[PDB]
Amino acid sequence: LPEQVAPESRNRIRVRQDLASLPAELINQIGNRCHPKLYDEGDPSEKLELVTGTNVYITRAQLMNCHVSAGTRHKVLLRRLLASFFDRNTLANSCGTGIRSSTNDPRRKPLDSRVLHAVKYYCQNFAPNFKESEMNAIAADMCTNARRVVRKSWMPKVKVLKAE
Numbered sequence: 001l002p003e004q005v006a007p008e009s010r011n012r013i014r015v016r017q018d019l020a021s022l023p024a025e026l027i028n029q030i031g032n033r034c035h036p037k038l039y040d041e042g043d044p045s046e047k048l049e050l051v052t053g054t055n056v057y058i059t060r061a062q063l064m065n066c067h068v069s070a071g072t073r074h075k076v077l078l079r080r081l082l083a084s085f086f087d088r089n090t091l092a093n094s095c096g097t098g099i100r101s102s103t104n105d106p107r108r109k110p111l112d113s114r115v116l117h118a119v120k121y122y123c124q125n126f127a128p129n130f131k132e133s134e135m136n137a138i139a140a141d142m143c144t145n146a147r148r149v150v151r152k153s154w155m156p157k158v159k160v161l162k163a164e
Contacts, residue, residue, distance in 0.1 A: 097139045
């Protein structure tokens, strides 16, 4: 079973769920089957195709991590999900999406615009109002001043729903 390797750069955060399944608080915001493999039981180390026909594959546990960390912030999800493909010095050498030089001298590398296509679109499925003009600035930026994972929601008795 091919899988992505963890960065081990943080404290031992409690994340010991089953094989899959996003919490009800994210289900309350998606509601339209935003890649239902994150609801369907498989394995945490299993790779999942992010967008059909793109052949862009991310490990379920890394998409789970992207979703719990960015669960109320769609531009955090973009940052998390892009950094889950541009793991190497590709984005350190090349000036983000559009792959155009910042100087009159060649110092840049082939950036994989196929993962950008899937990530930008997939983040627009999570946020119909999230324009590509934010995403194209963010992909070239890839810098933040704080973690901002402290979403701290509760939503009591939200689990019960009307019959259909």
